[PDB]
Structure 1
């Protein structure tokens, strides 16, 4: 009598109209379980020490029987694991699922719990962009008054990134996914009290359907296509999203030309490089994420979806462009054309979310005599 719990996988009421956008919730359940198996088999041959880590990856990629595929099913198994989110989130914002506050506020807590885990995971190969990535990004906490000089040295276990900084990331990294797996079952738990949303935003109690033959096979399809776009990168462009300077071991006395995190952080980084004031830059960085927790308190339209909200559609897809911009600016260096652009886009990100998109639904209500 576990399998009363499998009714959430078999006899679960679910709507009928939901298109591919909802599959991205399940796929994380695959990427996560996929990534754990791969990263585990990397642990068998990884060493957490600085004199042996970078080589340890080589032991995998060279001497091991198919050790190399696992590295790239796993690194790029994180990249695809964030294409899935950002679309899994955009659904929740565009189709207005954030009214399930209990889930959404936990959706945030999964995001942060992850997007620090990749940061730790990117260190472990112990190359330049690994080291220098962590060197820059930890120092941002130094901007805080009265604490930062103490907290950063504590996280480092010293006065600069070194051995004990590495070894603890490996332990903070190879644990949190087992904490993330818990919060997912939690995250679903509050969802299975309410049942999922549809493109319309309307109560779908009338046209529910089971889950066992219909969405299962739909998830088998959607999972299959995911394994394509992953393995293509593994089998046709593995260094694509990477950064080749990583394949030089760490040299703390030789700074690389372009320091940057990987593509999935960069929109955050561009916001930071926009502001000259260091501390004020930080609170913008953390706020670019946490602002998701301010969305439902800024809901204004008496409708839920955006299939039936024209002005918000135009603003929504504008926000996506602002993101894509910030992804691009962060990857590119800091000069007078790109500085100016990076400033404008960052202002749009906060402006568009807080002001226009609420303002729209207010206007949209007025046209409908509300």
Structure 2
């Protein structure tokens, strides 16, 4: 063949995924997050790898290996920062990525959406087991409290946690397996991320007005490549500003104290990007149900596609559910807050309320305001 860019077994893969790829013209800026999410990953894996090259995974060397990396390894400090803060850039993006899909009904592309849920779960795990590594008070205590949760699982419970980590409590034998796990999972993320885009590419890419784009697509590269690179910088600048001016802005100070099993800090809480669920977790008293609430707080995403009733895909022309949507983010935002606070009166209530308003907006309002919204259009 002529082109020699559309004939070669490998280039043909690229020229069909970053060039010549039919993308709708009206794609919104919300679509810039898949891109970011991907480069966000390349970045972590890089900085991480480069950072792992100076780490020691052992109760007696962990904390200082990290410290040493920062005080001794040239540009070590920067690398750690980028990696740590990057974790967040990662979640902020993955959360805006979910969003966009939730409200353009991108989720109607089931398979491409289900894998996405698997991406979120995976990206989490890798970030939980990764924060222990520095082995500071929170690293340790967070690991001990959050892992012990499985304990509620009746019968085959205690025996799981008791095997999960080392032997009897978060100690050396678990820092190791955590380090290993942390090193492995990211590559699995990338693996799956490929499957994600595959399923995607099956159908076109969805678009803001939610109606067939075939009418007029545009070559990805000439356009979207530029578009995304723009987004990359527009979003990467704050990342760095934060990473270079307030490095600890989002980091608990208590995690600057080498882990010590004889001093449980007050207010043990996982990283912000987990809070919303930490909240919904301590909403229901019965320890068991609590885990379930927690599990369901994320797993519910698998159900979203079966709760779509609107005769329309996106909700651009759906003002009612439109407020419902924002009323929802606001809700998550509140759960986050409630999670960072102690378990005391003003909170405890606002907590289980917000937590309840979470499952209703997804399980019962949305679908309902959905059909009702259809009648109003004479359907």
Cα distance in structure 2, aligned partners of 1:200 and 1:333:
43
TM-score, normalization by structure 1: 0.99
Per-residue deviation, residues 312-338 of structure 1 (Å, max 9, x unmatched): 101000110110001111011110010
> SS of 1:159's equivalent?
coil
Per the TM alignment, residue 203 of structure 1 is displaced from its structure 2 partner at its CA by 0.8
Look up the match of 2:121: 112
Which residue among 12, 20, 23 is the counterpart of 1:4? 12
Query: Is 1:146 equivalent to 2:155 in the alignment?
Result: yes
Cα distance in structure 1, aligned partners of 2:235 and 2:361:
32
Per-residue deviation, residues 24-44 of structure 1 (Å, max 9, x unmatched): 011011110001110111111
Which residue among 104, 112, 137 is the counterpart of 1:95? 104
Cα distance in structure 1, aligned partners of 2:326 and 2:147:
33
Look up the match of 1:193: 202
Which residue among 304, 320, 324 is the counterpart of 2:313? 304
Query: Is 1:155 equivalent to 2:161 in the alignment?
Result: no
Per-residue deviation, residues 66-124 of structure 1 (Å, max 9, x unmatched): 00000110011010101101110000001111110001111110110111111001100
Cα distance in structure 2, aligned partners of 1:18 and 1:226:
18
User: Could you list the runs of 5+ residues in structure 1 that have no partner in the other structure?
Assistant: none
Which residue among 170, 176, 189 is the counterpart of 1:167? 176
Look up the match of 2:68: 59
Look up the match of 2:36: 27
Cα distance in structure 1, aligned partners of 2:366 and 2:236:
36
Query: Is 1:283 equivalent to 2:292 in the alignment?
Result: yes
Cα distance in structure 2, aligned partners of 1:85 and 1:31:
10
Per the TM alignment, residue 198 of structure 1 is displaced from its structure 2 partner at its CA by 0.6
Cα distance in structure 2, aligned partners of 1:311 and 1:115:
32
Per-residue deviation, residues 185-242 of structure 1 (Å, max 9, x unmatched): 1000011110111101111001100011110011111111222121111111110111
Q: How big is the alpha-carbon RMSD for the aligned residues of Structure 1 and Structure 2?
A: 0.7
Per-residue deviation, residues 127-181 of structure 1 (Å, max 9, x unmatched): 0000000100011100011111110010112010000110011100111111110
TM-score, normalization by structure 2: 0.97
Look up the match of 1:82: 91
Cα distance in structure 2, aligned partners of 1:355 and 1:243:
37
Look up the match of 2:5: none
Per the TM alignment, residue 364 of structure 1 is displaced from its structure 2 partner at its CA by 1.0
> SS of 1:160's equivalent?
coil
Matched residue count? 370
Look up the match of 2:3: none
Look up the match of 2:353: 344
Cα distance in structure 1, aligned partners of 2:257 and 2:166:
24
> SS of 1:209's equivalent?
strand
> SS of 1:121's equivalent?
coil
Q: How does 1:154-233 map to 2 (within 5 A)?
A: 154-233=163-242
Look up the match of 2:372: 363
Cα distance in structure 2, aligned partners of 1:213 and 1:241:
38
Query: Is 1:324 equivalent to 2:324 in the alignment?
Result: no
Q: How does 1:264-279 map to 2 (within 5 A)?
A: 264-279=273-288
Cα distance in structure 1, aligned partners of 2:236 and 2:347:
36
